[PDB]
Amino acid sequence: ANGPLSLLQTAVRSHTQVLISVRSGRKLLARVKAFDRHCNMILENVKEMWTETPVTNGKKGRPVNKDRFISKMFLRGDSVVIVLLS
RNA sequence: UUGGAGUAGGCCAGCUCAGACCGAACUCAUUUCCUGCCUUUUACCGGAUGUGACCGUGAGUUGGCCUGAAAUACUCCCUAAUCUUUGGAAACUCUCUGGAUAUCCCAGAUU
């Protein structure tokens, strides 16, 4: 309501896209469907991208950004580095 | 915190088991002796020794009755602020050790 989590409520009240950086080094782009005080959120229309360096024949290749589309998302709170309300 | 299997109280009757304290109470009969009183024995005296009955008792279980309650209700066991549950992670490089041993790779350790 009046705390920081209200922006997630503002994410609920507007259904806007949100960019989430996670402690695994990956990034999420999703619309916030539900949240709580414990920052456990449920998301819809989810597109998750990350960066990996493929090692081909023992040589470290260039970093490639790839992605995956997930319809329904249950992201757990403590792994989130940071949340950006776009 | 939940699931599974359960269903009340009162009373009546049958059955089984329980004296050891079944019974915080108390009689009678009788076998074999010993004693007493005794003309005879029933009835008696009072100790031992066993052995039966009778007045009662409890638990378990089965059926029934009475008043209800009516999927209500009750029941048993059971499964975000530091020491765990609201993550010091993630990622990569360097060095060292071993295998390979010209390297790549990988395991372990460390930053």
Q: Describe it for me?
A:
With 86 residues, the protein is mainly β. The protein has one helix and seven strands; from the N terminus they run H-E-E-E-E-E-E-E. The protein has one helix spanning 6-14; strands spanning 17-22, 27-34, 41-52, 55-56, 59-60, 64-75, 80-85. The strands form two sheets. The protein has a five-stranded antiparallel sheet. A hairpin with a 4-residue loop joins strand 1 (17-22) and strand 2. The structure holds one RNA strand of 111 nucleotides. It comes from Chaetomium thermophilum (strain DSM 1495 / CBS 144.50 / IMI 039719) (Thermochaetoides thermophila). Residues 5-86 form the Sm domain. Plays a role in pre-mRNA splicing as a core component of the spliceosomal U1, U2, U4 and U5 small nuclear ribonucleoproteins (snRNPs), the building blocks of the spliceosome. Belongs to the snRNP core protein family. It is found in: Cytoplasm, Cytosol; Membrane; Nucleus. The PDB classes it as splicing/rna.
